[PDB]
């Protein structure tokens, strides 16, 4: 019986914010190699709105599974995901936001490494 779009268009969404957030993570690192200073404050700008939608969404996932009654990992993922019809999109999708997730966390430790990186980096954490 139960079919809800819920989780599967936050992961949806969140693949596209995760993507969208490494491309601008990469772009940051170009702009840091050809020392391009004032596009790194609006870089900062565009990547705000992605970091706040991914961590609500997160937090949306989150409840999702924890009123299911399931723990809050793949193993959860997966028992949420057992008897429904969307059940294996639900687990390819979560698997391919975590991948993205770290990716980017990566990408971000690089360009660090080189504040901007911050809230980038704490975000990161808390989804991961």
């Known amino acids: 019986m139960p079919d809800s779009p819920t ?3 936050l992961f949806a969404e969140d693949i596209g914010h995760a993507n969208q957030l490494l ?3 990469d772009e940051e ?3 840091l190699e050809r020392r391009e200073l004032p596009v790194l404050q609006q870089l900062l700008g565009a990547k705000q709105p992605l970091m706040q939608q991914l ?3 997160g937090r949306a996932r989150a ?3 924890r009123e299911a009654g399931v723990s809050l990992d793949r193993e959860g993922l997966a028992r949420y995901a057992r008897e429904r019809a969307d059940g294996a999109e639900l687990l390819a999708r979560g ?3 975590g991948e993205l997730l770290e990716r ?3 990408a971000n430790l ?3 490494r080189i504040a901007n990186q911050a809230s980038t980096g704490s975000l990161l954490n808390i989804l991961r």
């Open 55 to 57: 961590e609500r969404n």
């Open 29 to 31: 690192f170009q702009a």
């Open 110 to 112: 690089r360009n660090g």
């Open 7 to 9: 989780l599967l268009d």
């Open 95 to 97: 698997d391919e936001l």
């Open 63 to 65: 409840e999702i599974l």
């Open 23 to 25: 491309q601008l993570v």
């Open 104 to 106: 980017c966390q990566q």
